[PDB]
Amino acid sequence: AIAGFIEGGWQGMVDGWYGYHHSNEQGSGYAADKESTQKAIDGVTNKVNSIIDKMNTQFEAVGREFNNLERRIENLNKKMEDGFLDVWTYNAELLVLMENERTLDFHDSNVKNLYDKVRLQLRDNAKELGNGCFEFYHKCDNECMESVRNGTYDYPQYSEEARLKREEIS
């Protein structure tokens, strides 16, 4: 999705994280779907917190308190301190790597979901170009464009109107 049908990424879309781009005979502008975004930032913020806020911290005093005739006991403490370091280091590294993917696949899914919703709203009164953009037949007004972005698509309007543009010049 993210590097699939859509290949790049819009620097002009500063309103949100996911959104649209319309290009008709009266304009060419960007827009966002504040619904699909706000779940991502809220969820992403939740993920970052859930990782931080679930750590239990307790008061501990760490020092070197064994003399030269207690090296075995100090070695016992070294194995413990080192052992806990490797446990926390390995878990932290893999947690970030595994969760960093999940954020990227999370952003993958929401974009594909927005694309899939439009694909069924328009059925075959538009064309799948493979770049994510949809090639309209029926000619779409900004009101008609809005009916796609925020779902208000009164499909009865262009049901027959598409027929008068869809298969005509063929």
Partner: protein
């Protein structure tokens, strides 16, 4: 030439890079590091309690009253002890302190600490209380001795058998220190204590200790071949302590009222106290953070994040940036 509706995501001018389980060096719009690497660089109070900062003194030199180690206690309560790596003023007269390390552990966090004189010098009418002075413990260039104990010597070529007791009429535990002097030969024994064979007996409800001097040949430390071994016990309230000796007795003069609720450790650090507060202290500086991990120092004192061997733990929060 038809109309188009497109689907896409946000991109920006971010250079932040995150690594995933399957890809490395992936630039993202937004990111957050959960690793903590910042410390204020100062010694701070732990939960509002000032640490006991011994400047150039060790715990043993501080307790016994090393003449070069500052009196007056100042802090009646401390959260942790800051010693230097190799304190200069440990034990001017060579010897040892029994159970020093467990004693250090107990004194790491003290709720109340007050020095009260328990056995004044006037309580030794038949002995010499002013000649127990060595060049090993100098003060203002003049030879001196530990402040909080008294080095008893014979008077008029006689050392009467000492029998003294102390009842601890206080409502708090008392830390008492005493010692034994190991001579170098039998003549030093007679020239200092007049009794060729000597002993020390200390008794409480729980303490039953008998010591004898070990006359032997040792190396010179601080110009001294003799040694003095010091001992300590905690005298519970209304419990009494009994001293019996006929030579080589380093008698106590001052003791310590002590109250201990929590426990801590002793930190080795040279950096300067900075009139601050913190929940996590490290020998190089204090940590104010909520992050789950850090890599500042492993020898932490307080409520701290987990120490890791890492330079970066960057979580990807935003989208896949593409230029």
């Amino acid at each position: 030439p038809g109309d188009q509706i497109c689907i896409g995501y946000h991109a920006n001018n971010s250079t932040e890079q995150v690594d995933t389980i399957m890809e490395k060096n992936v630039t993202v719009t937004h990111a957050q590091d959960i690793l903590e690497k910042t410390h204020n660089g100062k010694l701070c109070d732990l939960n509002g309690v000032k640490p006991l900062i011994l400047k150039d003194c060790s715990v043993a030199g501080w307790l016994l009253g090393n003449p070069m180690c500052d009196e007056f206690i100042r802090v009646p309560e401390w959260s942790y002890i800051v010693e230097r790596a190799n304190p200069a003023n440990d034990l001017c007269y060579p010897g040892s302190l029994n159970d020093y390390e467990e004693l250090k552990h107990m004194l790491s966090r003290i709720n109340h600490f007050e020095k009260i004189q328990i056995i004044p010098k006037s309580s030794w009418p038949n002995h010499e209380t002013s000649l127990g002075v060595s060049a090993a413990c100098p003060y203002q260039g003049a030879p001196s001795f530990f402040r909080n104990v008294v080095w008893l010597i014979k008077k008029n070529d006689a050392y009467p058998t000492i029998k003294i007791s102390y009842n601890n009429t206080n409502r708090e535990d008392l830390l008492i220190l005493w010692g034994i002097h190991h001579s170098n030969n039998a003549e030093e024994q007679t020239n200092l204590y007049k009794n060729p064979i000597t002993y020390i007996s200390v008794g409480t409800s729980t303490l039953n200790q008998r010591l004898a001097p070990k006359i032997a040949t040792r190396s010179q430390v601080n110009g001294q071949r003799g040694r003095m071994d010091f001992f300590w016990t905690i005298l519970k309230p209304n419990d009494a302590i009994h001293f019996e000796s006929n030579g080589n007795f380093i008698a106590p003069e001052y003791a310590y009222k002590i109250v201990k609720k929590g426990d801590s450790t002793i930190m080795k650090s040279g950096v300067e106290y900075g009139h601050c507060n913190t929940k996590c202290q490290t020998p190089v500086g204090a940590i104010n953070s909520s992050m789950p991990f850090h890599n500042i120092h492993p020898l932490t004192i307080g409520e701290c994040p987990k120490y890791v061997k890492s330079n970066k733990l960057v979580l990807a929060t935003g989208l896949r940036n593409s230029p």
